């Protein structure tokens, strides 16, 4: 069962940890798009701003990362389920705050 | 002379062209010759090449230039007081143009999502 | 020649074509039959080893033939001496095209859920 | 043959028709005849076995004709100096369907609540 | 009744202890999305927009 | 003389144009040629060597010339006796622009993204 | 797993800890955008406004930057287990705990 | 005299004027020509040596009374019962004036990006 919860929250860290940022209503080629490869190179330093034509209802937005904490809140309920069937002090699963 | 002819523009009108009008035919035909080859090279290499092929470029030569010469005086009726037409609201029409289910026939396409990519120069 | 034929088209359109309407239905459907054959390639041989199947083909280019043909003209009304009339308003600058519910007769089924898969290559 | 025929549709239509509209209602029962049979292929047996599927069978296909037959000419209006008439406004897009509630009818029926189960392949 | 709850728990945590992302509108064809597998493959490293 | 000439003009019209028309004609066709010299120092050497590059600035001239000589008169409607015509809807028109569709096919291309970049002055 | 998500961590500080900022509906010549470069530099001391013509829909956007704590607290997990698997002190390894 | 003349305003405006409207188009292009001035003081020197700068302010003094003499009298339709035209919306404007792009084509365009700067007087 913790083995589950640490290979998905992994994968979950590789995939998922940071949003994925959308733009809606921009052609490919207004953006100029290499048609040859489907990517574009931009200048991605520290506070330097984008403008972009669009006014087709054009638009950013983004998917949310996911909460890895969501994962570690069921690692500790296991941990402290690995505690109680084994009976070892609960240091050795660093499972108490005492 | 270009891949379609006015023979072909002309079978698509169902209406036999006037004098002053083939000639604005052969000039629309030499446009969508051009633009279509822009676009792929080869092109006269595989309407040689191909039969089937060469149908294509046939067909969609002619609708481009069709789509245009289509009521080109921009009348929408005419009269005089024993006979009188109106036509349907058709669009200001103002380019010659190939559909992107033209392009696609030709077998090129534009992919509707594309990435824009950050980057940054390395130290060194 | 082609599977459908101009008889098809006159058929269901309930008028007799003149001589220009028929060169029109001539190129027309040699472009519908070559429009199935693009995306069905075993078509002309699907055909005829299947006869049902034939006579949905053939009923099928007919009537995409026919809703590019019925007014081709584009008149909504004429006048003539005394007689007049007007026809039910439709849409201007219609192209040849087979629908989705005459791709699923033909047995292609377009799936409106599909999905985008990210990927990163593994390290070595 | 198709288990409707003209005199269906006709006795539907509450006029007679030409013979170029005979030829036109012989087409449209062959489209209506696959049609069902596509959905339902025991159809043959049943609307020879048992006559009430049969009577509901025959009266499908006559107005799945009528439905585009009614005014497929796509008037308005006509007139001359004398006798005049006009009629109530109708789609121009008359297309061989059979309605959801008549599927019903012949005992097939669709579910608009489906649903999407997520997989993923188990581990060996 | 426990052993029922960490099941559940577990199962969650398989199907669901993530978002589900959704596209609406967009054409498959028009993402590119191949015929024969309904799968568009694109590059997934951070920062991309 | 410039590049294009009034012949090209009327070859994608469809009518002989006045003595009057051919002035407003020549001092148009000038006018597109200055337009497209200004973005591109080149163009009369480029139409020089290249016949390809020459057909597209003969064409991209006469076309934009075209849309403004074109009914440049403002009639919607005129009635002479029992005679009558009725035309499209039009903008204002007012004045000579070469489309963005028309710099693609003349080689110079503007990009819909570009950067605001912030700038402090380092210290010293 | 704790040495991918110190590289995922690493990564996010140098691309995305930082909200991107966008315009939209705006025509690169207005912005007076040069176009040999694509750039326009313009002078960001403190608490300068700046004002655009504004076009029919125009307006301006952020994407979110990334929380990179929801990396660290996948981290703190790893340490948990580090120390749980090796029987260490769990001073040696979640040096704030105790 | 100003740079441009009432013949290069006939150039564009295909209909010939009367005494009226020479006085009006001189007037007018006087005024056309002082507003070019007030923005561009080396306009005229400039013009003196450069002979494509010419044509630019030629043409656009040209155009900056073309804009504003058509259809001065402001009629949309006009009739004596056996002729009759009547005309497109034209905007019904009331002033001499000149194009940001015009702007742009003498070398003088502005930029639409400004910022305002807080300041307070240091201390002392």
Same mark, same amino acid.
């Given at each position: =069962? ?36 489907? +990517?574009?190179?931009?200048? =991605? ?16 937005? +983004? ?27 609960? +240091? ?7 | ?36 080859? /822009? ?6 290499? %595989? ?19 069709? /789509?245009?010469? /289509? ?23 103002? %380019? ?13 396409? /534009? ?14």
């Amino acid at each position: =069962a913790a083995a589950q919860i640490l290979m998905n929250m992994q994968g979950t860290a590789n995939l998922m940890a940071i949003p994925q940022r959308l733009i809606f209503g921009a052609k490919p080629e207004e953006l100029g798009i290499n048609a040859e490869t489907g +990517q574009r190179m931009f200048d =991605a330093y520290m506070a330097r701003i984008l403008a972009f034509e669009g006014g087709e209802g054009a638009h950013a937005e +983004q998917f949310s990362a996911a909460e890895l904490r969501n994962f570690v809140d069921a690692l500790d309920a296991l941990d402290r389920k690995a505690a109680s069937y084994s009976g070892l002090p609960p +240091q050795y699963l660093s499972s108490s705050s005492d | 002379a270009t891949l379609a002819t006015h023979e072909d523009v002309t079978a698509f009108w169902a209406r036999t062209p006037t004098a002053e009008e083939i000639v604005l035919i052969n000039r629309r035909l030499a446009q969508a010759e051009r633009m279509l080859l /822009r676009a792929i090279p080869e092109l006269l290499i %595989k309407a040689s090449s191909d039969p089937v092929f060469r149908a294509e470029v046939i067909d969609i030569e002619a609708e481009a230039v069709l /789509r245009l010469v /289509r009521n080109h005086e921009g009348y929408l009726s005419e009269t005089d007081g024993n006979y009188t037409y109106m036509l349907q609201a058709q669009d200001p029409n103002r %380019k010659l143009e190939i559909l992107p289910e033209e392009w696609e026939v030709l077998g090129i396409v /534009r992919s509707g999502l594309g990435i824009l990519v950050p980057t940054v120069v390395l130290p060194s």
